[PDB]
Paper text:
We therefore explored the possibility of using a more stable orthologue as a surrogate and focused our efforts on archeal RadA from Pyrococcus furiosus, a protein that was already structurally characterised and is closely related to human RAD51. Here, we describe the complete process of generating robust, RAD51-like surrogate systems from this archeal protein via two distinct approaches: by stepwise mutation of the surface of the RadA to humanise the BRC4 binding area (HumRadA series of mutants) and by generating an archeal/human chimera (ChimRAD51) in which all of the BRC4 binding part of RAD51 is stabilised by parts of RadA.
The structure of HumRadA2 also highlighted the need to introduce further mutations at the back of the Phe pocket (particularly V232Y216) in order to force I169M158 and K221M210 into the same conformation as observed in the HsRAD51:BRC4 complex.
Numbering used by the authors: 108 to 285, 307 to 349
Write the structure that this text describes.
């Protein structure tokens, strides 16, 4: 299948991403708390649901939360301000809270069965969010030989993530605070409620930067 692109809500940021975030890839967005990673995840969970003419893929979402940062109220606000039905937007976001790194790995594996069933529907899964990919791995692996073990589990988790994205034509979006993903985006605060995105690593895309805002519509220019 050909690559689908999900608009982030920002024209500037979509331009940097060659149209938007891609299916059949793991897009990693990293930054300090408040850099806009979570607002971008919330905006994408709504945007993917829009028709292609609006920047979406008529798709369903699966969201894995390691730190309880998912906000239904924010999804609802973004949905309403984009002229979508908040109830329908929420019902197309399959949500799961991971309490440890092993639970997190298991949820990715269990998600394959769910995705299979939605493939021939009008709204198949086009987006899988993992916020925030490493929080459990960093807190659990402390002591002698902890670092080498963490790297091994992360690599397998990311391989399980890559497998779903290619096999089912899904865009995998992961967040991180501060490893090989297909696209790395460094996020930081600009001047005001403005953020700056820096494309660090990309195989088909040139390096660069884009500026965006955080509003009642989630993410825009």
């Amino acid at each position: 299948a050909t690559i689908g692109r999900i608009s982030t809500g920002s024209k500037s940021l979509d331009k940097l991403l060659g149209g938007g975030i891609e299916t059949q890839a793991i897009t990693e967005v990293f930054g300090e708390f408040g850099s806009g990673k979570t607002q971008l995840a919330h905006t994408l969970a709504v945007m993917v649901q829009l028709p292609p003419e609006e920047g979406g893929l008529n798709g369903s979402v699966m969201w894995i939360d390691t730190e309880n940062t998912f906000r239904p109220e924010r999804i609802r606000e973004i949905a309403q301000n984009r002229g979508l039905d908040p109830d329908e937007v929420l019902k197309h976001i399959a949500y799961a809270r991971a309490f440890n790194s092993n639970h997190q790995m298991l949820l990715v594996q269990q998600a394959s069965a769910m995705i299979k069933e939605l493939l021939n529907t009008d709204r198949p899964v086009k987006l899988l969010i993992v916020d925030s990919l490493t929080s459990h791995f960093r807190s659990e692996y402390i002591g002698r030989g902890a670092l080498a073990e963490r790297q091994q589990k992360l690599a397998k988790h990311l391989a399980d993530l890559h497998r779903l994205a290619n096999l089912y034509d899904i865009a995998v979006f992961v967040t991180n605070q501060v490893h090989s993903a297909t696209l790395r985006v460094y996020l930081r605060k600009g001047k005001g409620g403005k953020r700056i995105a820096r494309l660090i690593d990309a195989p088909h895309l040139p390096e660069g930067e884009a500026v965006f805002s955080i509003t009642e519509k989630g993410i825009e220019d």
